[PDB]
Specification:
The complex is a heterotrimer, with 1 copy of chain A and 2 copies of chain B. By secondary structure, chain A is an all-alpha fold. Chain A has one domain: Growth Hormone, Chain: A, CATH 1.20.1250.10. Helix content of chain A is 63%, strand content 0%. Chain A contains 5 helices and no strands. In chain A, helix 1 runs antiparallel to helix 5, helix 3 packs antiparallel against helix 4 and helix 3 runs antiparallel to helix 5. The radius of gyration of chain A is 18 Å and the shape is globular. The two termini of chain A are 30 Å apart. Chain B is an all-beta fold. Chain B folds into 2 domains: 102 residues, Sandwich (Immunoglobulin-like), CATH 2.60.40.10; 101 residues, Immunoglobulins (Immunoglobulin-like), CATH 2.60.40.10. Chain B is built from no helices and 15 strands. In chain B, strands 3, 4, 6, 7 and 8 form a 5-stranded antiparallel beta sheet that branches. In chain B, strands 12-11-14-15 form a 4-stranded antiparallel beta sheet, with no helix packed on it. In chain B, a hairpin with a 7-residue loop joins strand 3 and strand 4. Chain B is elongated. Classes of the chains: A mainly alpha, B mainly beta. The interface between A and B is medium-sized, with 26 and 22 residues. Chain A: One of its GO terms (cellular component) is endosome lumen. Chain A: This is Prolactin. Chain A: Keywords: Disulfide bond, Glycoprotein, Hormone, Lactation, Phosphoprotein, Secreted, Signal. Chain A: One of its GO terms (biological process) is prolactin signaling pathway. Chain A: Prolactin acts primarily on the mammary gland by promoting lactation.
């Protein structure tokens, strides 16, 4: 028997308390991993002109106020619309660097981990959305052909950069939700 | 014979709470006339130029952004205009997003207790609380911590990370020594603050 | 008959875990685990890699997102039966790796000890014996990566080892025994 279960050992269901506790840890690891995965690209390769991320079409709460104003239910629907959108690009990233790219500095290392953990964390998302029953549509990744050295390096840049931008949103939201629902303290 | 302003240098930006931020520039040469400065900036996506709201709050040569005008996960294209009586010049535009420019003030109410526990065990219990400004209760803001302590006269400090725990227990202290103790705080992700006001203890 | 007894399940890294059992004539043991929710029933992946009376779950089978109903069934003729089911949450059964890296930074002459955690909060413990003695005097370090051991018998050769215990889980193994002067 696991520490939080009683009455019926069967079905059981993992308490919310430590269901976030695991998901927070991941989004924390991911951003704090794609953050240095970026810092290694920049140093080793690079101008910046990028006001274009695929995740901008979404109704993202981009203030502290706007966040404290958004419906908890819709915040998860939000959080998972991002993660999902991030899945495709992350597989091009890993295959492209890995593959027909005569492999450079092993940013790769950091990018594989990120692809795993992401998807790991995403299923912990569907589980937490499953517990608070209301899936919806998510923003399409178009910079496929983008993935010249000056122009292609800039496309890598933009992608890499948004990962750092979004994985922060995501992580920062789960910090919120976990600390709104569980303890509002 | 009397020159235009030269060129203002804005490089440093900081946000101590993830709600409001603040920017400091470097006046140009100035020519030989009195020079009056102003600041315009553009938010990512939009193509609207705005004017700084608060010149006074962060002091001299500073622009302060209240919560209203501050907004994270945006990339501010900040540019400042030195404008003297005979001519005028801009700064080399700067791209600041509120996200990765965080840097809090240090921890407060650093209190330091001795407690004896279960059987021949006397631990030094380090307690303290985060800066009144920072919103860690709503989870918006997330603090990690570190402490360092050394005996009054010494050569090296010891360092203990204590991520987001606002208390810590220390077990290696030769009794009767006057130790010194300080605290400093990284955010979620960001810049470590300066150390805190130190306390000491002795046993 | 048969009487299969599940000893323990442990996960060194929340990324794979292994299960161990106790026997109880030709004895054939086989393990089969289930998940909550969908309940597809299927036999254990591989027994070999964790050795004897063990079933090892790779990172392909190991998910922290599902609770494991696990049973062992021994099947010699006229003596074939099933064991007490075991419900496991992967994160409540952490048995870590001895803390990697152990430094013994001698000098008001004291031994300065420092170490590093395993993969990637956690309490530690250190023990040491002068080697002349055949027992250890053990010190609790709480959550410190480094400990200051003060008074010792000079010129002697000591033996030190460390341990760690994740927030919610079981102690680790004792580390490798470094000597000092």
């Amino acid at each position: 028997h696991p520490p939080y279960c009683r009455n019926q050992p069967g079905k059981c269901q993992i308490p919310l308390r430590d269901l976030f506790d695991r998901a927070v840890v991941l989004s924390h690891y991911i951003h704090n991993l794609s953050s240095e995965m970026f810092s290694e690209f920049d140093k080793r390769y690079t101008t910046k002109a990028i006001n274009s991320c695929h995740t901008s079409s979404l109704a993202t709460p981009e203030d502290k106020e706007q966040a404290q104003q958004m419906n908890q239910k819709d915040f998860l629907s939000l959080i998972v619309s991002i993660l999902r959108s991030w899945n495709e690009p992350l597989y091009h990233l890993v295959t492209e660097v890995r593959g027909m790219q005569e492999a450079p500095e092993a940013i790769l290392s950091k990018a594989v981990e990120i692809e795993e953990q992401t998807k790991r964390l995403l299923e912990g998302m569907e589980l937490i959305v499953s517990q608070v029953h209301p899936n919806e549509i998510y923003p399409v990744w178009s910079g496929l052909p983008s993935l010249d050295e000056e122009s292609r390096l800039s496309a890598y840049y933009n992608l890499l950069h948004c990962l750092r931008r979004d994985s922060h949103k995501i992580d920062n939201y789960l910090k919120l939700l976990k600390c709104r629902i569980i303890h509002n303290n | 014979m009397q020159s235009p302003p030269g060129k203002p240098e804005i490089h440093k930006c900081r946000s101590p709470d993830k709600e409001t931020f603040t920017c400091w520039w470097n006046p140009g040469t100035d020519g030989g006339l009195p020079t009056n400065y102003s600041l315009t900036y553009s938010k990512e996506g939009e193509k609207t130029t705005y004017e700084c709201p608060d010149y006074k709050t962060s002091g001299p040569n500073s622009c302060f952004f209240s919560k209203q005008y501050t907004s994270i996960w945006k990339i501010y294209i900040i540019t400042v205009n030195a404008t003297n009586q005979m001519g005028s010049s801009s700064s080399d535009p700067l791209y600041v997003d509120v996200t990765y420019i965080v840097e809090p003030e240090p921890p407060r109410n650093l209190t330091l207790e001795v407690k004896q526990l279960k059987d021949k065990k006397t631990y030094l219990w380090v307690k303290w609380s985060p800066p009144t400004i920072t919103d860690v209760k709503t989870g918006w803001f997330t603090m990690e911590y570190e402490i360092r302590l050394k005996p009054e006269e010494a050569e090296e400090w010891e360092i203990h990370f204590t991520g987001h725990q606002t208390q810590f227990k220390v077990f290696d202290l030769y009794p009767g020594q006057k130790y010194l103790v300080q605290t400093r705080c990284k955010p979620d992700h960001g810049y470590w603050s300066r150390w805190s006001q130190e306390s000491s203890v002795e046993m």
